[PDB]
Motif scaffolding. Structure first.
Motif, PDB file in Angstrom:
ATOM      1  N   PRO A  42      44.983  11.421 135.932  1.00 27.97           N
ATOM      2  CA  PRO A  42      44.298  10.457 136.803  1.00 27.97           C
ATOM      3  C   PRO A  42      44.395   9.029 136.287  1.00 27.97           C
ATOM      4  O   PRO A  42      44.830   8.757 135.167  1.00 27.97           O
ATOM      5  N   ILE A  43      43.959   8.102 137.144  1.00 32.10           N
ATOM      6  CA  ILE A  43      44.107   6.678 136.868  1.00 32.10           C
ATOM      7  C   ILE A  43      43.402   6.321 135.571  1.00 32.10           C
ATOM      8  O   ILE A  43      42.270   6.751 135.318  1.00 32.10           O
ATOM      9  N   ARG A  44      44.084   5.499 134.759  1.00 34.71           N
ATOM     10  CA  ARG A  44      43.537   5.091 133.441  1.00 34.71           C
ATOM     11  C   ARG A  44      43.757   3.597 133.212  1.00 34.71           C
ATOM     12  O   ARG A  44      44.636   3.037 133.870  1.00 34.71           O
ATOM     13  N   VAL A  45      43.041   2.991 132.262  1.00 30.79           N
ATOM     14  CA  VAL A  45      43.260   1.555 131.914  1.00 30.79           C
ATOM     15  C   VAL A  45      44.343   1.494 130.839  1.00 30.79           C
ATOM     16  O   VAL A  45      44.605   2.536 130.229  1.00 30.79           O
ATOM     17  N   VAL A  46      44.954   0.318 130.651  1.00 27.84           N
ATOM     18  CA  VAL A  46      46.059   0.157 129.660  1.00 27.84           C
ATOM     19  C   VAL A  46      45.502  -0.527 128.411  1.00 27.84           C
ATOM     20  O   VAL A  46      45.057  -1.687 128.534  1.00 27.84           O
ATOM     21  N   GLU A  47      45.511   0.155 127.262  1.00 27.30           N
ATOM     22  CA  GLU A  47      45.095  -0.533 126.018  1.00 27.30           C
ATOM     23  C   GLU A  47      46.058  -0.245 124.872  1.00 27.30           C
ATOM     24  O   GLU A  47      45.981  -0.954 123.867  1.00 27.30           O
ATOM     25  N   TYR A  48      46.917   0.758 125.006  1.00 27.02           N
ATOM     26  CA  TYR A  48      47.769   1.117 123.852  1.00 27.02           C
ATOM     27  C   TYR A  48      49.220   1.286 124.285  1.00 27.02           C
ATOM     28  O   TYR A  48      49.664   2.435 124.360  1.00 27.02           O
ATOM     29  N   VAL A  49      49.934   0.192 124.551  1.00 30.15           N
ATOM     30  CA  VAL A  49      51.385   0.309 124.868  1.00 30.15           C
ATOM     31  C   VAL A  49      52.116   0.768 123.612  1.00 30.15           C
ATOM     32  O   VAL A  49      51.744   0.302 122.525  1.00 30.15           O
ATOM     33  N   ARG A  50      53.102   1.650 123.762  1.00 29.33           N
ATOM     34  CA  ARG A  50      53.907   2.150 122.618  1.00 29.33           C
ATOM     35  C   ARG A  50      54.898   3.176 123.154  1.00 29.33           C
ATOM     36  O   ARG A  50      55.077   3.183 124.384  1.00 29.33           O
TER      37      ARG A  50
ATOM     38  N   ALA B  26      54.550   5.532 115.497  1.00 25.30           N
ATOM     39  CA  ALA B  26      54.963   5.065 116.816  1.00 25.30           C
ATOM     40  C   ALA B  26      56.175   5.840 117.314  1.00 25.30           C
ATOM     41  O   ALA B  26      56.257   6.192 118.497  1.00 25.30           O
ATOM     42  N   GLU B  27      57.083   6.185 116.403  1.00 27.44           N
ATOM     43  CA  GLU B  27      58.273   6.987 116.791  1.00 27.44           C
ATOM     44  C   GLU B  27      57.809   8.347 117.312  1.00 27.44           C
ATOM     45  O   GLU B  27      58.267   8.772 118.385  1.00 27.44           O
ATOM     46  N   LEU B  28      56.919   9.000 116.574  1.00 30.39           N
ATOM     47  CA  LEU B  28      56.449  10.344 116.978  1.00 30.39           C
ATOM     48  C   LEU B  28      55.736  10.226 118.323  1.00 30.39           C
ATOM     49  O   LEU B  28      55.853  11.157 119.111  1.00 30.39           O
ATOM     50  N   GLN B  29      54.982   9.149 118.541  1.00 25.89           N
ATOM     51  CA  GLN B  29      54.202   9.017 119.797  1.00 25.89           C
ATOM     52  C   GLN B  29      55.136   8.934 121.011  1.00 25.89           C
ATOM     53  O   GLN B  29      54.774   9.508 122.048  1.00 25.89           O
ATOM     54  N   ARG B  30      56.245   8.196 120.924  1.00 26.84           N
ATOM     55  CA  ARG B  30      57.120   8.047 122.118  1.00 26.84           C
ATOM     56  C   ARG B  30      57.704   9.419 122.457  1.00 26.84           C
ATOM     57  O   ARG B  30      57.755   9.752 123.650  1.00 26.84           O
ATOM     58  N   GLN B  31      57.972  10.247 121.443  1.00 26.83           N
ATOM     59  CA  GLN B  31      58.398  11.650 121.708  1.00 26.83           C
ATOM     60  C   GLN B  31      57.116  12.475 121.905  1.00 26.83           C
ATOM     61  O   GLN B  31      56.031  11.900 121.767  1.00 26.83           O
ATOM     62  N   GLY B  32      57.211  13.765 122.227  1.00 23.97           N
ATOM     63  CA  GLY B  32      55.972  14.524 122.496  1.00 23.97           C
ATOM     64  C   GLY B  32      55.452  15.223 121.249  1.00 23.97           C
ATOM     65  O   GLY B  32      55.943  16.333 120.969  1.00 23.97           O
ATOM     66  N   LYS B  33      54.484  14.621 120.537  1.00 22.64           N
ATOM     67  CA  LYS B  33      53.898  15.321 119.365  1.00 22.64           C
ATOM     68  C   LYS B  33      52.441  14.909 119.164  1.00 22.64           C
ATOM     69  O   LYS B  33      51.559  15.643 119.624  1.00 22.64           O
ATOM     70  N   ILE B  34      52.204  13.802 118.449  1.00 21.41           N
ATOM     71  CA  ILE B  34      50.813  13.332 118.157  1.00 21.41           C
ATOM     72  C   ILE B  34      50.148  12.949 119.481  1.00 21.41           C
ATOM     73  O   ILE B  34      48.905  13.057 119.550  1.00 21.41           O
ATOM     74  N   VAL B  38      45.807   8.235 120.433  1.00 19.72           N
ATOM     75  CA  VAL B  38      45.336   8.576 119.068  1.00 19.72           C
ATOM     76  C   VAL B  38      45.711   7.381 118.206  1.00 19.72           C
ATOM     77  O   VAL B  38      46.685   7.476 117.441  1.00 19.72           O
ATOM     78  N   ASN B  39      45.000   6.271 118.389  1.00 23.32           N
ATOM     79  CA  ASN B  39      45.386   5.059 117.636  1.00 23.32           C
ATOM     80  C   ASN B  39      44.183   4.582 116.834  1.00 23.32           C
ATOM     81  O   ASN B  39      43.096   4.470 117.416  1.00 23.32           O
ATOM     82  N   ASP B  40      44.385   4.328 115.546  1.00 27.14           N
ATOM     83  CA  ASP B  40      43.322   3.865 114.670  1.00 27.14           C
ATOM     84  C   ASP B  40      42.981   2.408 114.950  1.00 27.14           C
ATOM     85  O   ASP B  40      43.790   1.644 115.483  1.00 27.14           O
ATOM     86  N   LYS B  41      41.763   2.028 114.574  1.00 29.13           N
ATOM     87  CA  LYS B  41      41.280   0.668 114.765  1.00 29.13           C
ATOM     88  C   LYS B  41      41.070  -0.066 113.452  1.00 29.13           C
ATOM     89  O   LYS B  41      41.650  -1.138 113.249  1.00 29.13           O
ATOM     90  N   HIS B  42      40.261   0.477 112.549  1.00 28.53           N
ATOM     91  CA  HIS B  42      40.011  -0.138 111.253  1.00 28.53           C
ATOM     92  C   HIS B  42      40.533   0.772 110.154  1.00 28.53           C
ATOM     93  O   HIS B  42      40.279   1.980 110.167  1.00 28.53           O
TER      94      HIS B  42
END
Lengths: 50, 75
Positions: A42-50, B26-34, B38-42
């Motif tokens: 479903p529809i989501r906001v964008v905060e983590y491009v990668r 970031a490499e693993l994220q673009r492929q299907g795994k992690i 799932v991104n850390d902040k601090h």
């Protein structure tokens, strides 16, 4: 003979009779996912491009 | 100055390791795994002489095997 002096009977009955084979067909509705596919993710906001 | 030197060196290579660990994650994220989201902040690094620790926080906690994958990637 396998029944007893008093008989138990039924007053009314409903059964469907048909005259031609062509009448035996009916209709139901579907979605036709070819043009309106079921949704996912479903529809989501964008905060983590990668 | 032994303790100062040890903690300066320990906190230095940690940044350079985290820099490339981010690329690998970031490499693993673009492929299907992690998976995304799932991104850390601090991240905080604490050094006491030779010994050191690394703490990373998350908004959504990754599942058990995600933790293994990211720890293996970091190590």
């Amino acid at each position: 003979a396998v029944e007893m002096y008093v008989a138990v009977r039924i007053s009314r009955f409903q059964l469907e009779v048909l005259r031609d084979l062509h009448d035996l067909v009916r209709s139901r509705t579907y979605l036709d996912v070819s043009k309106s596919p079921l949704a996912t993710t479903p529809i989501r906001v964008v905060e983590y491009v990668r | 100055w032994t303790g100062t030197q040890n903690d300066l060196v320990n906190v230095s290579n940690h940044h350079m390791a985290y820099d490339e660990y981010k690329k690998r994650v970031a490499e693993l994220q673009r492929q299907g795994k992690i998976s995304i989201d799932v991104n850390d902040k601090h991240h905080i690094v604490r050094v006491f002489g030779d010994d050191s620790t690394f703490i990373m926080t998350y908004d959504e906690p990754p599942s058990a095997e995600e933790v293994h994958l990211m720890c293996a990637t970091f190590v």
